[PDB]
Amino acid sequence: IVGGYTCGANTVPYQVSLNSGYHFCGGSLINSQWVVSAAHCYKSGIQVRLGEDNINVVEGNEQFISASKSIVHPSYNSNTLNNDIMLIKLKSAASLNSRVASISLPTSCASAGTQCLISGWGNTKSSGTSYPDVLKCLKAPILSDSSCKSAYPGQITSNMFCAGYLEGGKDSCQGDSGGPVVCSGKLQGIVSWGSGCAQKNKPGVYTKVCNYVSWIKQTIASN
Ligand SMILES: CCOC(=O)c1ccc(O)cc1
Ligand SMILES: *C(=O)CCCCCNC(=N)N
């Protein structure tokens, strides 16, 4: 996250870190046994780390749980990033508490101008590379469809939305991928792609979770 702020320990209790011997992507806990992330974050050997703040120090409240299944959307396209969504089943159920909690799926889509919270352990620099120990947060609005298409002509499908700031300096970044965009207590987005980080006129692009509620429910119900 570039131009954000320190969230504070466990203030984003649905935020998870996906770890393969290092932090590689974020994700969102949606019930005690299932996590939502980006399809482009797929690999084998995923360990889900819940209740994290400092991802480099054991502080208390952490639960490390191996993924038993990682389910990429069958229509995920690795070149366009259309359908950039993946479900991860945990080998065992997380124990839920004030510091490890699920986030509700949306009942309807959010409108342009809705303020959201984006969080993650990604790069905090627009220029060069700096990775934080602790979780970073950013408040950001969802942009209009016309602004989003103007920013990324021919690249925005109906399964994507833009959020952030056209002036530059505030954005999600590498390492934030797969993490949550939460608007009034609902998971509306997943960190997906963008052109550089925090560049003028190049906002972040996010998977539109409201288009996938039925698929999520059906996939969970059958696994
Ligand atoms: C047409 C989809 O947009 C891209 O070409 C694109 C894909 C991945 C990425 O990181 C940036 C742009
Ligand atoms: C995931 O970490 C791949 C990097 C894309 C993150 C989103 N980029 C952006 N908001 N400019």
Ligand SMILES: [Ca+2]
């Ligand atoms: Ca820790």
